[PDB]
Structure 1
Amino acid sequence: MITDSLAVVLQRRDWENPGVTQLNRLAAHPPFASWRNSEEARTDRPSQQLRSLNGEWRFAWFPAPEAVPESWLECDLPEADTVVVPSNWQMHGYDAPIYTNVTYPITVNPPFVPTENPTGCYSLTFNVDESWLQEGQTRIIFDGVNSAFHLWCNGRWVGYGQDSRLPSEFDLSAFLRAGENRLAVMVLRWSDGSYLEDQDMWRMSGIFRDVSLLHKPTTQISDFHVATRFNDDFSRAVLEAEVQMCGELRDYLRVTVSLWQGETQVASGTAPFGGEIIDERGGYADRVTLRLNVENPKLWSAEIPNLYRAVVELHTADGTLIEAEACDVGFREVRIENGLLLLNGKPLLIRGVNRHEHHPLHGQVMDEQTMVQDILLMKQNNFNAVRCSHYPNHPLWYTLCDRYGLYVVDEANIETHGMVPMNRLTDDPRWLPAMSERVTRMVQRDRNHPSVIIWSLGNESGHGANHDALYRWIKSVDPSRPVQYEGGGADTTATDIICPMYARVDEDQPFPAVPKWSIKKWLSLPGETRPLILCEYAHAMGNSLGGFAKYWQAFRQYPRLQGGFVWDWVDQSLIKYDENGNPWSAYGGDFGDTPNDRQFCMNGLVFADRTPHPALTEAKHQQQFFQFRLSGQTIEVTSEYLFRHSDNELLHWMVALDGKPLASGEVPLDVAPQGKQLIELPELPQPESAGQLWLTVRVVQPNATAWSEAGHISAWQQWRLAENLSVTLPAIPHLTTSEMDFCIELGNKRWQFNRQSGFLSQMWIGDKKQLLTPLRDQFTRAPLDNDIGVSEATRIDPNAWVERWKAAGHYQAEAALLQCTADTLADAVLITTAHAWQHQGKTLFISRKTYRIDGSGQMAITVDVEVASDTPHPARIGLNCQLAQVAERVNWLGLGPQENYPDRLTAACFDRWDLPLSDMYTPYVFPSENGLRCGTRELNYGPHQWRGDFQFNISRYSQQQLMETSHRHLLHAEEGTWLNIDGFHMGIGGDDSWSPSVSAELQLSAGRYHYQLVWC
């Protein structure tokens, strides 16, 4: 009793000791269910031996473990509440979640943690059947506890356990009694294991995964591994099943392994226990290896996820079943040959993405519905691989990836980003036991899943000897999967794959000890033969993914560039509520959390509620599995599939003058893997009317699949066909001049030019005004996250684009009128103006404009702009005004329908687009410049029409308000409609969000610019 008390148990401070990572914890193993019926195991029915303890628990929060009273161990405290398990206790208001990127959330003094260590006390009162306690073994399984815990059953201390992302199991057979039982779990927020868990994510705690009880017989299956081997052409396979038992060996014990393909048995084997001779001392008596021959096996791949069911039976010679386990088996071979990563003898192209386990409401608690939604969206957007972001995932995730067909990179829960010099722990032999536990337990748990093709040793922990040791351990235990690791320069001896983070396509980044070469250069460095797969690239912070097409051109051109994983899938934003109870999305610092990294927690391609960002369509287009070539008038279609024929594919084509369609047709796709099909279009129409002809093709899946609905569009492409230049030709407007204004009349329209300012100040139709703000030049945009580019909240950068623009005075430049002159032509009125934008006597830009109002009511605007060569290149060159009208729809002829930028427009298609005004605004959580549409020839707002070749955005929010507002929920619509029309716009970048990344050719670096606009 005295040794079960809190005073004794807490005295040794096991959570401040890297040498003690657990106490009385059972060995790791693949998932078990302990079926007592072979049919139930084969069909994967729920097992009566596996009981879920998820539900209602009693919870009490304490500021430190010492504050817990001794009465909690025997009876529930009066102040304990009832909460749902699994859950994070930060999502119930007990203490704040903390978002920190690199800096540790506690003072750096390993292995010690602060004395103010928040503590969560969970207790559950439950009942156990007498048959469970009569025989066999009863264990409790904690799928995940953050970050360390002590366990009591009926007042007796059981065990400890540390690692937060892997299951902990304890034997409860000696502690349970018939009838009512009570479990007490003390969960600590910080421990010495927290030093290895410095990932860029919200820091939470609690029992955040499932809790269950498993009953097994005394003679039991303790472990089983499956392995598949093949011949040269994969016509013959051998299934290798090694089974280990626990308990007492008896001569009558047998093991049967049967392989089932859906409903028919394809192979089976039976043997007594006792393995082959291992060494001078003999072999394993408690192990048996079963070999099964499979003829013409169906192979597993992301394209076609063929699965078998393997059932392992422990039974007597007379035929009495003792216990059965089962797993899904996929026949596939992953290996690196001659510098290429091959799956089933074919080189892979990885269309991957990094995915954190995050839910905006439940925090880091994962459920099947959210996982399935994520997988469906990823497959619908042409992703075929996922990287478990820096920790092992929920066990069901791998089963779902097996079933739906995604390749998986499984990562050990090790990240020491906050150390200086970042390998302080991973080069220290005293931390080798803890790291080894984190690696070996993950490999033991997950080695049977076919979807897992690559092991990863962790993330951002430098390079230490511990990494080399664990790499060699994995290569010894599981040689069927390559091992990768990025830390310490991405090409060290602890990785089979060069896996850089945010390496650029063509530009080198020479950091002193760990340079980031361009990937093309990296491939050919002397002595380098490994394949290159980027573990993180195209940082998707906010309005981003500029330059993605360059990465994918490089991927397709170079054989040893086998793709990469985008960072990342989903924003890590949390939901808060205002005084009215209206929810809004929150990021770092919104909970009063200790030093934070603000909006750097939102880097996703989809919103926290799984609503797509515009960049997702660019990703889908660049990753598509069909590539198109047009050589008039033949479309050549090339399949990038490695294994599957195009049997669910239909090619639609269409030719339009403006859209305004002219012709269309449908051709079924019949192309072999990596094959080619020539499609001959019928005689295309040749209209005599002026305009550009466009050919658009789309590949449509007519039949539904497990992951998509009938009619799903999987790939598309567009081309220009033939242009007919317009060669045709088209009352006198009255000019009235006063010392304050130039005022022009034509019938029922009036234009007013303010002679003091030199801008068009008002326009009339009838008696109603059209402008709330004059038409003026604009050279700035509300800064994107890529423009701000300051990774740590405290590390200011003078090289960021926003800092250069601020220092040069681009946001404060004042326009000085240089000329304002009006002339009356024979059939038109000519207005000439000139302005100079200056900051402390330095002329930044000069604008010269001519306004020509003709007898047809149209106003033709010509703009010429000179930019000083020594000022930073401006974000945009264009015009800006606030219109009085608020219309419901926006109709334009240009690129669309989604938001697109000069850096990010390969997925948009030229056509006639119509959308509600609300669809013209992209609600990024951190407000910024958004909603641009490039390549626009005509724009129709309510009464107005603009024609030319320009980029535009149109919304209810001015650029100033977007600049000054930190959350999208604090934006308020303005009185009218703000319109920005740009002749030219800078790229958005996106190679990373902490350094300038807009290529030189998408910068506005030309000295002079010209554009033309007609307003009718």
Structure 2
Amino acid sequence: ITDSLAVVLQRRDWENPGVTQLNRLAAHPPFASWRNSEEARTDRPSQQLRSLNGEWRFAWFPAPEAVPESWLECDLPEADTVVVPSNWQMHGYDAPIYTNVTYPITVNPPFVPTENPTGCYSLTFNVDESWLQEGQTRIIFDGVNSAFHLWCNGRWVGYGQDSRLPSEFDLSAFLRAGENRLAVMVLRWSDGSYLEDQDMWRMSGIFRDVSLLHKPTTQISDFHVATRFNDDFSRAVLEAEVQMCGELRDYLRVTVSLWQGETQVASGTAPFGGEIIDERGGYADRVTLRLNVENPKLWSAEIPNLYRAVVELHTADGTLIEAEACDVGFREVRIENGLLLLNGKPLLIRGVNRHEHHPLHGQVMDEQTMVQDILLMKQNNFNAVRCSHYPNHPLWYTLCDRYGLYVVDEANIETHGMVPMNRLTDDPRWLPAMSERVTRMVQRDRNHPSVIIWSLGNESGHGANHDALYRWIKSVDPSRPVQYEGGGADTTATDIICPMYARVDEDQPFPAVPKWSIKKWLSLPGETRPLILCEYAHAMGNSLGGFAKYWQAFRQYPRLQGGFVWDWVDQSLIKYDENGNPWSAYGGDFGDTPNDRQFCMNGLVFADRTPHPALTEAKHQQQFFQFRLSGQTIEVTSEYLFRHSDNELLHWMVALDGKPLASGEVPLDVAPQGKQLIELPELPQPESAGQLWLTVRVVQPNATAWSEAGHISAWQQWRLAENLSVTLPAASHAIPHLTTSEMDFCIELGNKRWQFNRQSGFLSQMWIGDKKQLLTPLRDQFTRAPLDNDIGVSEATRIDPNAWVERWKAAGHYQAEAALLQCTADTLADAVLITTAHAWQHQGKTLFISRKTYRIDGSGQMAITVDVEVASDTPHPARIGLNCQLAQVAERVNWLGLGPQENYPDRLTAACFDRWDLPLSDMYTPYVFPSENGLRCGTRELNYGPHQWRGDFQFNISRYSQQQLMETSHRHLLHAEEGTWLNIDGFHMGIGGDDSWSPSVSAEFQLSAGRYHYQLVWCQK
């Protein structure tokens, strides 16, 4: 009766920050309750641990009230069978919402809306009574969003909040032998919701594992591990503190053993009872052991050396009560003298922020994926990750521990939508709630070596609650530094200056919470901390422009210790069309309101874990080897702190305009932080004209745990020389023949023909034989299909008149009208010469002037010359080039320039100058939200079909017009156009990315010269 809904829901616990749990057990590191040392030692599976994952019964209600009393008793008729864990929006129950800042519900803490999607999960199961006799049985929910009540066998059990941490309950008294039934009522909204305003999809349910744990009555309740070293790490101390629950008896003992694989490295045994701590004594029920270790093997992201630790609770006679274990890493993290050190060395964080997101499963994680991510990261030169912005699924940590990645563990708190942001954080009333969120995390994760920094949360301003919490941790776990960006990135609550989106050299002086150039930030009077950006280089869409600036700075300033890119994967979900065709969806694609659209897509990889091109730029800037070229000598520098180049091969090679003349191979032998000189054999001194380039790559001969054999980890190229061409074209036995209609001019020469329209002033068509070659006339182009960055909005609501796009639009760039100023034809001795001049205007203003010459010779080559003038007072244009639609469509694309991936002016360091050949398909970048893409720069020769172009340009080529792109919101809606669209740029604006909600293109990358000149040659074979 008091188990009655009517009664239970009376309280409305979910609308009270004062109640965050009921009857929930205490937090702790992961337990298995092994009953055999070996098993525990080898991480086998424990039978005292049982999963409840699987088919369960589900039913959805618009509100808690609507739940029917019977539910407690009996399953519903209208119930569905569902898999757990999962997110119910993922099953059609309701909509997932994609909002960033703005709270999905109305702001009226601690009140949640009356209509609150309730999900009734139920499960019937069996219990061995052996369990029912002796010991203790509890249940564990690794994750339930956002809040929930729980019943067992009709009996009310408890309640819990905080979607990201585990909830545990003692079932012991409600279980019956055989058949039992759980009834979990889960709520969308709760007061907890106010602390969960992360910029992600808003989902719900039982999204993490469900399990059962059988433990002795007298058991190990908790344990902590710690490592201390001498000045040189030649020796360590492992210190373990163990606590027990149950009743205490003098024959109890504890043993802790350290293993190195098969080897037992150290052991210690003792009886409970601590040292005096205060006037009242010590902890009778705790004990601390200290193990000495000589020449321990250190753990690092470079080399994740691990040890295994076993904790056995037993009697003096030898009888084991139970065991727990963990992996152990010997490492010291400390900040000293402005620097963050690891095992004595100063780190350089090649980080990325990562959410727990699956295109298909929503917020549900799995081993398989996790590993994938890791592998990728590792393969791309990343060494650290930040759990934006909540504790992750447990396995994660282990993986990181094992694979080797530094981790920042972050409390589940974001109140981004509040106003001001710290409305709650500065309120005592919320302190307890907040508190739980931190304490628990710590309690749970503190034994993992990969965790090296604790984070108080995200975008919640700065309030006293923060200071208090910061302190708490400091006291409890001094082994790791604490950081927190809120309220200015440099408050009393952070050990590290960890801004988000601060520029390398420019200051963004917002009131109260300005963002200084990071170089400047360090020097502020009295500042001494290290600086690591918690978020930088917004990877949204075609982005990452400027990445290298950061790297360079990081490399030059000691106190600049890196950052975390924002972010790993796009938060896109799959949908289907009528033809049961899957497609990537974003904000508003579920009729979700309100929404922030594409904003959830900022990854370096596509939801399927397919890379964006940017990834490469990253990989390259983050490489661990650095090169210098001097004369015939290469200087190699290692950015490894701890390892030696023991799986490294250096391949080099020389080519002339793509023609390889010589290649070599040399094994690397460099010490962490050392240099290695490489002597080059006499190099070839080609006579022929062209560019001579040297290229080096670093290869991993043998596979690794996260890489295959022959993996490339680093590269670099240099232009050795240039042999200018002084030659002249041989005589033609003929010269083109000009014909003048009234409508145009006709140039003929053999099968070849060119036509220039006299009223348009453009090259309108051309034939080879009787085949027309263009579907569209060749013409100047000054714009682009806006990039996310060009559009620059972070909130669907707020538009920036300063956004490039805004400016371009307003300027009429997108709709200026060309005007023929002049068009003339003339016959020279050896060729035909065409001359044009056009003006683009808009509302009486002349934005640009384009002046050209076309010259066709006896060899059938068409040389183009372009000279453009841009009004100083117009916004710098996105680009300066030409375009046209070719009639033809081919398979491959071949060029001599930078490649092979998409590259832009401010994002091309990872690219190589060579000869590339790909399929047309590859020349297009399927950004979910479509825009200008696929560009390749520094191209000297381009081949497509019978065509060939030469000069010095950048280009792109695909089946979509810029217009199409610009007008289509999703990749799935584009359709190939008639022929092939070609964009040839003499110049192109940078792409930016310092942030995506402001103009982030550096000046060096804007087309501000006022005058531009370029040339080209077009021919056929």
The alignment's TM-score, normalised by the length of structure 2, stands at 0.99
CA distance in 2, matches of 1:520, 1:133: 64
> 1:192-243: per-residue Cα shift (whole Å, max 9, x none)?
0000000000000000000000000000000000000000000010000000
Deviation at 1:659, TM superposition (A): 1.8
User: C-alpha distance in 1, partners of 2:581/2:13?
Assistant: 44
SS of structure 2 residue aligned to 1:576: strand
Q: 1:949-1007: per-residue Cα shift (whole Å, max 9, x none)? A: 00000000000000000000000100100000000000000000000000011000011
CA distance in structure 2 between the aligned counterparts of 1:821 and 1:974, rounded to whole angstroms: 33
C-alpha distance in 1, partners of 2:839/2:191?
62
What corresponds to 2:284 in structure 1?
A: 285
Equivalent-residue separation in structure 1 for 2:551 and 2:424 (angstroms): 37
Query: 1:868-909: CA deviations, max 9, x gaps?
Result: 001000000000000000000000000000000001000000
Whole-angstrom distance in 1 between the partners of 2:794 and 2:848: 31
| Alpha-carbon distance in structure 1 between the residues aligned to 2:975 and 2:728 | 46
Partner of 2:320: 321
How far off is 1:660 after superposition? 1.2
Deviations 1:368-413 (A, max 9, x none): 0000000000000000000001100000000000000000000000
Q: Give the equivalent residue in structure 2 for 1:421.
A: 420
Determine the C-alpha separation between the residues in 1 that align with 2:543 and 2:686: 40
Deviations 1:119-146 (A, max 9, x none): 0000000000010000111000000000
Offset from partner CA, 1:412-448 (integer Å, 9 cap, x none): 0000000000000000000000000000000000000
CA deviations on 1:6-47 (whole Å, 9 max, x unpaired) are 000000100000000000000000000000000000000010
Give the aligned partner of residue 901 of structure 2. Answer: 898
CA distance, structure 2, for counterparts of residue 541 and residue 160 of structure 1: 39
How far residue 279 of structure 1 moved from its aligned partner, in angstroms, is 0.3
Identity, % of aligned positions: 100
Residue matched to 1:720: 719
- Per-residue CA shift, 1:598-653, capped at 9, x if unaligned? 10000000000000000000000000000000011100000000000001000000
Return the alpha-carbon distance in structure 1 between the equivalents of residues 704 and 1005 of structure 2. Answer: 40
How many Å separate the matches in 2 of 1:594 and 1:1005? Answer: 41
Q: Following TM superposition, by how much is the alpha carbon of 1:304 offset from its aligned partner in structure 2, in angstroms?
A: 0.5
Deviations 1:911-949 (A, max 9, x none): 000000000000000000000000000000000000000
Matching residue of 2:11? 12
Looking at structure 2, the residues matched to 337 and 118 of structure 1 have their Cα atoms a distance apart, in angstroms, of 50
Instruction: Show CA shifts across 1:757-781 (max 9, x none).
Output: 0000000100000000000000000
**Cα offset, 1:455, TM superposition:** 0.1
Cα distance in 1 for partners of 2:227, 2:652 equals 44
Q: CA deviation at 1:738?
A: 1.1
Structure 1 counterpart of 2:219: 220
Q: Quick one: distance in 1 between partners of 2:724 and 2:922? A: 33
Helix, strand or coil for the counterpart of 1:1011? strand
Tell me the distance in 2 between the aligned counterparts of 1:461 and 1:278: 37
Query: What is the CA deviation profile of residues 539-590 of structure 1, one whole-angstrom value per residue up to 9, with x for unaligned ones?
Result: 0000000000000000000000000000000000000000100100000000
Give the secondary-structure state (helix, strand or coil) at the position aligned to 2:21.
coil
Q: Do structure 1's residue 578 and structure 2's residue 581 form an aligned pair?
A: no
Deviation, 1:720, is 0.5
- Write the distance in 2 (CA, Å) between the matches of 1:724 and 1:1013: 20
CA displacement at 1:790 relative to structure 2: 1.1
SS in 1 for 2:2: helix
C-alpha offsets along residues 463-501 of structure 1, whole Å, 9 cap, x if unaligned?
000000000000000000000000000000000000000
TM-score (norm: length of structure 1)? 1.00
Match of 1:207 in 2: 206
Q: CA deviation at 1:796?
A: 1.3
SS at match of 2:469: helix
SS of the equivalent of 1:934 reads strand
- Show the counterpart of 2:446: 447
Alignment partner of 1:283: what SS?
A: coil
- Counterpart of 1:278 in 2: which secondary structure? coil
Structure 2: state its 5+ residue gaps: none
**In structure 2, C-alpha distance between the alignment counterparts of 1:904 and 1:93, rounded to whole Å:** 41
Per-residue CA deviations over 1:142-169 (Å, capped at 9, x if unaligned) read: 0000000000000000000111000000
Secondary structure at the residue paired with 2:259? strand
Distance 1:107 1:163 in 2: 19
Which residue does the alignment assign to 1:520? 519
Q: Separation in 2 of the partners of 1:748 and 1:282?
A: 104
How many angstroms apart in 2 are the aligned matches of 1:771 and 1:400? 56
1:939 to 942, 953, 970: 942
CA distance in 2, matches of 1:850, 1:251: 100
> What are the Cα deviations for residues 495-528 of structure 1, in whole angstroms up to 9, with x where unaligned?
0000000000000000011000000000000000
User: Residue 883 of structure 1 aligns with which residue?
Assistant: 886
Residues 32-47 of structure 1 mapped to structure 2, 5 A cutoff = 32-47=31-46
What residue is the counterpart of 2:924 in the other structure?
Answer: 921
Per the alignment, in what secondary structure is the counterpart of residue 853 of structure 2? strand
How far apart are 1:658 and its partner, in Å?
A: 1.6
User: How far off its partner does 1:801 sit?
Assistant: 0.3
**How far apart are the structure 2 equivalents of 1:722 and 1:425?**
63
Structure 2 residue 997 is the aligned partner of structure 1 residue 994: yes
Q: Does 1:60 align with 2:59?
A: yes
Q: Measure how far apart 1:305 and its partner are.
A: 0.2
Whole-angstrom distance in 2 between the partners of 1:441 and 1:153:
25
Tell me, in whole angstroms, the C-alpha distance in 1 between the residues paired with 2:920 and 2:658.
Answer: 21
The CA deviation at 1:728 is 1.1
* Alpha-carbon separation, structure 2, partners of 1:822 and 1:366: 68
Q: How far apart in 2 are the matches of 1:534 and 1:624?
A: 19
Aligned length: 1015
How far apart, in 2, do the equivalents of 1:582 and 1:596 lie?
24
List per-residue Cα deviations over 1:818-840 (Å, max 9, x = no partner): 00000000010000000000001
Render the CA deviation track for 1:738-769: whole Å, top value 9, x for unaligned.
Answer: 11010000111000000000000000100000
How many angstroms apart in 2 are the aligned matches of 1:24 and 1:172?
A: 11
The offset of 1:797, in angstroms, is 1.1
Aligned-partner SS, 2:694: strand
Secondary structure of the 1:378 match is helix
Deviations 1:157-187 (A, max 9, x none): 0000111000000000000001100000000
Q: 1:695-740, CA deviations, whole angstroms, 9 ceiling, x for partnerless residues? A: 0000100000000000000000000001111111111100000110
Is residue 2:979 matched to residue 1:952? no
2:965 pairs, out of 948, 962, 965, with 962
Alpha-carbon offset, residue 594 of structure 1: 1.3
Q: For the residues of structure 1 that align with 2:723 and 2:570, how far apart are their CA atoms?
A: 47
SS at 1:728 equivalent:
coil
CA distance in 2, matches of 1:727, 1:884: 35
1: CA distance, partners of 2:543 / 2:250: 66
Distance in structure 2 (CA, Å) of the matches to 1:795 and 1:879:
34
Cα displacement (A) at 1:61: 0.3
CA distance in 2, matches of 1:390, 1:49: 32
- CA shift digits 1:62-119 (9 cap, x unpaired): 0000000000000101000000000000000000000000000000000000000000
Q: What's the secondary structure of 1:912's corresponding residue?
A: strand
Helix, strand or coil for the counterpart of 1:559?
coil
- Aligned partner of 1:141 in structure 2 is 140
Aligned with 2:160: secondary structure?
A: coil
Partners of 1:114 and 1:832 in 2: how far apart? 70
Q: Partners in 1 of 2:666 and 2:113 — Cα distance?
A: 68
CA distances 1:784-825 after superposition (whole Å, capped 9, x unpaired): 000000111011110000000000000000000000000000
Provide the residue aligned with 2:873 in structure 1. Answer: 870
